[PDB]
Amino acid sequence: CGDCVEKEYPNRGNTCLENGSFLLNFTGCAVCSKRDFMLITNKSLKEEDGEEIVTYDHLCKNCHHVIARHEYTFSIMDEFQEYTMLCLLCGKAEDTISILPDDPRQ
Ligand SMILES: [Zn+2]
Ligand SMILES: [Zn+2]
Ligand SMILES: [Zn+2]
């Protein structure tokens, strides 16, 4: 309900994830008032030309209302990798890593 989160799309100093629920930003629901109560459902995955995308939602373990929506997208460009995340709860973040054909991933 947006009142579920302390901050809307908090920055994570570059952290981009396809899993979990950010309990440190979740202040507990406002449809029912419960905390440390959540599930994940409708989890989709997409892949275009080397880019990998993961989209999902968070649901209150008590009232099963949709707490928030999550998106994580990952792209490979020429010699580098790009990571981006956007979630009302988990946060908004972006990172880029330079790599080699030896696949070292820093
Ligand atoms: Zn809520
Ligand atoms: Zn709730
Ligand atoms: Zn999230």
Q: How many angstroms separate the alpha carbon of residue 68 from the centre of ligand 3?
A: 7
Residue in 2, 15, 17, 11 with CA at minimum distance from that of residue 71: 17
Beta-strand runs (E) in the chain: 39-48, 51-59, 66-77, 80-87, 91-98
Domain count, the chain: 1
Residue located via tokens 């109560």? 37
- CATH at 19: 2.60.40.4240
* 58 in a labelled binding site: yes
Q: What is the Cβ-side half-sphere exposure of residue 19, based on CA atoms within 13 angstroms?
A: 0
Q: How many angstroms separate the alpha carbon of residue 43 from the centre of ligand 3?
A: 11
Looking at the CA of 36, name the nearest ligand: 2
Residue in 48, 49, 103 with CA at minimum distance from that of residue 79: 103
Domain span holding position 92: 1-106
Looking at the CA of 61, name the nearest ligand: 2
